[PDB]
Each structure stands twice: as structure tokens, then as C-alpha cells.
């Protein structure tokens, strides 16, 4: 009930937008946003699996992972060259998954006013309001 290891493109099903790194900056504190499909190196994510059943995402080329400093109901998702975060990617529908970090689900946060917004954690409600599709590249 989890995605296998490998390189994928993650797409949000609620708005048909792809997970992207803002500006391709290889610096700490770079927001992970949702943006239109371009297929560049900042939109391809390598999924690596661990022993306990958790998986991590790394950007291709830039080599910036997905790092959440404080796992709280309202924290953002950023990119760090060294530090990482162990995610849980479970299956709710055939084809559509859901990603959580420390028990809190993710959120879409579609861009408003021509500016992307960082993916933010969701409060403990248990209802997956955002599902992701892992298209093989």
C-alpha cells in the first residue's frame, strides 16, 4: 500500500498541478509549491524507501530533499540540501495516494494572484483533502 522506489512526477488531482521547487534554488528555506507542468529538473522526484516503511523524496539534479523544520499543524514544506524527513505515502484509491509527515496530512495550497504558495501541513482531522498521483517518467 505504498509507492515503489524510483523517479516520478507528482501531480495534484484536485487542481491538475505538479509539485515544484520555487526557482530551482539549491538553498535552505526554499518553498515547495504547486505549478503548471514544465517537466524540468525541479519537478522530478526520486522516491527512496527505508526499512520501517517510510519514504523520502529528492530533487533530480538539484539534490534538494523535502524538509519540514517543525512538524506542527500549520508548518510549511521546504527544501534542504542535507536534512530530510521520513514521509508516509499511503493508498486511498487505485492510482491516487496521500502523503503525510508525522501523522499530519499535506495540503494543496494552489497559487493565488500569480504567485505560488508553499505546501502546508493539515490539522489532525483524518480526512484526506488532497490526493497525489505518481506518474512514471
Ligand X SMILES: CC(=O)N[C@@H]1[C@@H](O)[C@@H](O)[C@@H](CO)O[C@@H]1O
For ligand X, the binding residues (CB under 6 A) are: 20, 22-24, 35, 40, 42, 116
- Which residue in 75, 65, 69 sits closest to 109, CA to CA? 75
Least separation, in Å, of the C-beta of 43 and ligand X?
7
Give the residue nearest to ligand X (CB).
Answer: 24
List Cβ neighbours of 90 (8 Å cut-off, separation of 6 or more): 1, 2, 97, 98, 100
Least separation, in Å, of the C-beta of 132 and ligand X?
17
For Cα atoms 63, 68, 72, give the angle at the middle one, nearest 5 degrees: 170
Nearest residue (CB) to ligand X, 23 versus 29: 23
Contact criterion met (CB below 8 Å) for 89 and 99: yes
Least separation, in Å, of the C-beta of 19 and ligand X?
10
Nearest residue (CB) to ligand X, 19 versus 87: 19
Amino acid at each position: 500500500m505504498s509507492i515503489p522506489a524510483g523517479t516520478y512526477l507528482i501531480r495534484n488531482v484536485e487542481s491538475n498541478l505538479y509539485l515544484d521547487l520555487r526557482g530551482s534554488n539549491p538553498a535552505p528555506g526554499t518553498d515547495a509549491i504547486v505549478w503548471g507542468r514544465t517537466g524540468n529538473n525541479n519537478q522530478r522526484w526520486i522516491v527512496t524507501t527505508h526499512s520501517d516503511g517510510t519514504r523520502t523524496l529528492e530533487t533530480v539534479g538539484i539534490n534538494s530533499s523535502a524538509f519540514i523544520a517543525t512538524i506542527q499543524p500549520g508548518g510549511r514544506v521546504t527544501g534542504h540540501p542535507n536534512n530530510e524527513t521520513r514521509l508516509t505515502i499511503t493508498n486511498v484509491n487505485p492510482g491516487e495516494y496521500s502523503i503525510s509527515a508525522g501523522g499530519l496530512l499535506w495540503l494543496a495550497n494552489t497559487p493565488v494572484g500569480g504567485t505560488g504558495e508553499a505546501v502546508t501541513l493539515q490539522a489532525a482531522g483524518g480526512a484526506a483533502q488532497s490526493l497525489w498521483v505518481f506518474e512514471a517518467v
